[PDB]
Design a protein around this ligand. Structure first.
Ligand SMILES: *Cc1[nH]c(Cc2[nH]cc(CCC(=O)O)c2CC(=O)O)c(CCC(=O)O)c1CC(=O)O
Length: 296
């Protein structure tokens, strides 16, 4: 076959991601015909893998060859025969402070309403500023920006990568350093899932793998796997390559910001997976187990 079918969600950001993968595949393999198969997910309407399940069914029944996701949305477990095989070059991994009326988090007055449905984002903000009111916010990037503009929130937190890819860089009032808001696992990277026995597809995808990003995300995911994490839990997991070593930082927090368990590991790139697992067991042994129990 000379055709590759791409399964993707149907929001403006998911289609931007699908086009980025399609452009990269055409640049490496000029005779390939790339087709798009956009589809809704449970996540779009309201096991887990709320943003991926219908995509994976597409692959199992040979309706698509690859599924393109934002890495933070990929679950730590997969149906047999599927896996994540390519991790694309990481874009800015930071959280962003978005507000029409305020210039920074410090400028919000007590009682101001900040929208986010991420317990990872909430625990960290509540830890520093218990005077702010953190209210759930759901929806695609443009739906969230509308609710801000309609005055339902004073500010909201989104990933910088999403806003930059949509050409909405002007809505970023401030990129929050990882030390103020530790990113979710894989934040900023696009991941490609496919059928593991499909060697033709896996060969076509190799040119898209970004080694340095794959090392970072491997360590972040090994941590989350051990904690049995996902988007609904208050876990931050973030790796940087600093002078030839991986520096992994992780946190597990109580949603009210009362208790936050933090840890860090530094090591050789070859040990990315074992470093993540070790970090996760240090957190669990330190009280992360009970915080997650009270979540789940
Ligand atoms: C892991 C994680 N995912 C999300 C939210 C998310 N993922 C995909 C979408 C649709 C984006 C679009 O296509 O424009 C969304 C947003 C949604 O459907 O509500 C989160 C939540 C972020 C938050 O509410 O702040 C998380 C958890 C995390 O980042 O820690």
């Amino acid at each position: 076959d000379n055709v590759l079918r791409i399964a993707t969600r149907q929001s403006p950001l998911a289609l931007w991601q699908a086009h980025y993968v399609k452009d990269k595949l055409m640049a490496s393999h000029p005779g390939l015909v790339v087709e798009l198969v956009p589809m809704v997910t449970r996540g779009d309407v309201i096991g887990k893998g709320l943003f991926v399940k219908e995509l994976e069914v597409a692959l199992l029944e040979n309706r698509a060859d690859i599924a393109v996701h934002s890495m933070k949305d990929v679950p730590v477990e997969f149906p047999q025969g599927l896996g994540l095989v390519t991790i694309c070059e990481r874009e800015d991994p930071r959280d962003a402070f978005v507000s029409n009326n305020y210039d920074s988090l410090d400028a919000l007055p007590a009682g101001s309403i900040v929208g986010t449905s991420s317990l990872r984002r909430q625990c960290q903000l509540a830890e520093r500023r218990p005077d702010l009111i953190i209210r759930s916010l759901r929806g695609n990037v443009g739906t969230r920006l509308s609710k801000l503009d309609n005055g339902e929130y004073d500010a909201i937190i989104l990933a910088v990568a999403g806003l930059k890819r949509l050409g909405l860089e002007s809505r970023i009032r401030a990129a929050l350093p990882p030390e103020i808001s530790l990113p979710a696992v894989g934040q900023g990277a696009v991941g490609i899932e496919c059928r593991l026995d499909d060697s033709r597809t896996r060969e076509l995808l190799a040119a898209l793998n970004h080694h340095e990003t794959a090392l970072r995300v491997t360590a972040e995911r090994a941590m989350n796997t051990r904690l049995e994490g996902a988007c609904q839990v208050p876990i931050g997991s973030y790796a940087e390559l600093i002078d030839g070593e991986i520096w992994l930082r992780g946190l597990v927090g109580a949603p009210d910001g009362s208790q936050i368990i933090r840890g860090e590991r530094r090591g050789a790139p070859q040990d990315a997976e074992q470093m993540g697992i070790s970090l996760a067991e240090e957190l669990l042994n330190n009280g992360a187990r009970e915080i997650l129990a009270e979540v789940y």
